[PDB]
């Protein structure tokens, strides 16, 4: 709730990508539930929350991923928890998906038509998202990277290590998960994944570009 | 550095999108540098770190933004600080950008050709990023939304309010900032923005989907 600049900086400095997990250690259900809340409570463009969190504790499913998940093949067997994040497909301003968005905010027929023209201008004019399906999906997939970032940070504040994962064949992971009946492949598609647990090895040297190279002040 | 579940949960409940800032309150330079570090230290796919943070404190430049920034119109006049986050364009596995990435990790000719083979498979086969410029750019822009999320959360743990911003004409924001010579428009393009300051109104309550609607457990 309140931290000092030296605790805040250390909290973001201390989080590291953990590629080797201790299979003997596992996260508590209350610890992981608060990690998932970090995700659920994340902000998202126009309150869209275009995400779904699949928690893959089934061990037969983890083994089936191994062949096309080179980024986490040596993490799938030992991590305590695995999360695959999906992003909403085709979240157009006039889609049922956005009727639910407006409905969660209690919008009358007039409030909805004003919000609808705002969504349209955002998607069609401001960001040019309705050229094809991939650009619109990537917009919701961007929001899911917000939830991903917050789950990593919330985990690291609870002493739990993590690794974000993109190292897998999207097409094969999509098919494997949709054929296992875990989501409707016309409404959602995989966006990014993440492992959680406790490090087995040591945490390496934090390496990033300098602050003076990545910031330009405009005064 | 270490928080309890009540503190972590409260940290993500307390962060809210602030549309109304107190113009008499400014964030100190030391507080704002610690917010910028939160972004700099964020994880990124293959350590790409594909972001640049523009801090727009010039009030003439802010005023030039108001006509096409409906999402931020009143925030531009009262927020303490404004950050426009750029994402790298054309970040192909065989680009100079990725020679810099490999160079910061110190790889020899053998390690660079092995890593280049992994970047190739990741970008071309696994994620299908190389079918046009937009898909490759949107990959880096997803990374920058991680940096965005960490800046919002790091700011709120310091007691500083914020609001992520997508509500603006992107084409016109790219042009306006490139005409001030702030980046090379063939190397970078605007990804997302954020305002920071101290709110003038109180936090309204979280409205999110339930944990039971957005989490699917597979045991
Ligand atoms: C990427 C992104 C862009 C956003 N753009 C704007 C914006 O332009 N203007 C605005 O007022 N709010 C914007 N929001 C704020 C969201 O509406 C807000 O996150 C959501 O309604 C949830 O509220 P909370 O953030 O207050 O929890 C944006 C949020 C995100 C994540
Ligand atoms: C979106 C995303 C995907 C990532 N994918 C993988 C991955 O598949 N496998 C992996 O080992 N690390 C992956 N990483 C970890 C990064 O390589 C790591 O974050 C970065 O190099 C910085 O190191 P640090 O996080 O330990 O500081 C990923 C990171 C991000 C952000
Ligand atoms: O998220 C919002 O509420 C929002 C986004 C863009 C423009 N106006 C509002
Ligand atoms: O970020 C990495 O280190 C990474 C990303 C994808 C696949 N393997 C490694």
UniProtKB/Swiss-Prot annotation, chains A, B:
Q: Does the keyword Translocase apply?
A: no
Which UniProt keyword terms apply here? Flavoprotein, FMN, NAD, NADP, Oxidoreductase
Offer one Pfam family short name for this entry. Answer: Nitroreductase
Q: A GO term (biological process) for this protein? A: 2,4,6-trinitrotoluene catabolic process
Gene Ontology annotations for the cellular component aspect, listed alphabetically: cytosol
- A Gene Ontology MF term for this entry? oxidoreductase activity
The UniProt record lists the EC number as: 1.-.-.-
Q: PANTHER family, from UniProt? A: NADPH NITROREDUCTASE, OXYGEN-INSENSITIVE NAD(P)H NITROREDUCTASE
Q: What is this protein called?
A: Putative NAD(P)H nitroreductase
Q: Which organism is it from?
A: Haemophilus influenzae (strain ATCC 51907 / DSM 11121 / KW20 / Rd)
């Amino acid at each position: 709730t309140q931290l000092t600049r030296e605790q805040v900086l250390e909290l973001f400095h201390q989080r590291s990508s953990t590629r080797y997990y201790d299979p003997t250690k596992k996260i508590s259900d209350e610890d992981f539930e608060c990690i998932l809340e970090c995700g659920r409570l994340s902000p998202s463009s126009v309150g869209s929350e275009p995400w779904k969190f699949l928690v893959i504790q089934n061990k037969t499913l983890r083994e089936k991923m191994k062949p096309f998940s080179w980024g986490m093949i040596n993490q799938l067997d030992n991590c305590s928890h695995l999360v695959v994040i999906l992003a909403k497909k085709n979240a157009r301003y006039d889609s049922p998906f956005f009727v639910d968005v407006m409905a969660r905010k209690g919008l009358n027929a007039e409030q909805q038509q004003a919000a609808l023209t705002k969504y349209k201008a955002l998607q069609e004019e401001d960001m040019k998202l309705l050229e094809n399906d991939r650009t619109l999906f990537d917009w919701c997939s961007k929001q899911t990277y917000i939830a991903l970032a917050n789950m990593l940070t919330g985990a690291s504040a609870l002493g739990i290590d993590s690794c974000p994962i993109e190292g897998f064949h999207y097409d094969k992971m999509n098919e494997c998960l949709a054929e296992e009946g875990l989501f409707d492949p016309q409404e959602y598609a995989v966006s990014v994944a993440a492992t959680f647990g406790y490090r087995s090895r040591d945490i390496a040297k934090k390496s990033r570009k300098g602050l003076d190279e990545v910031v330009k002040w405009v005064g």
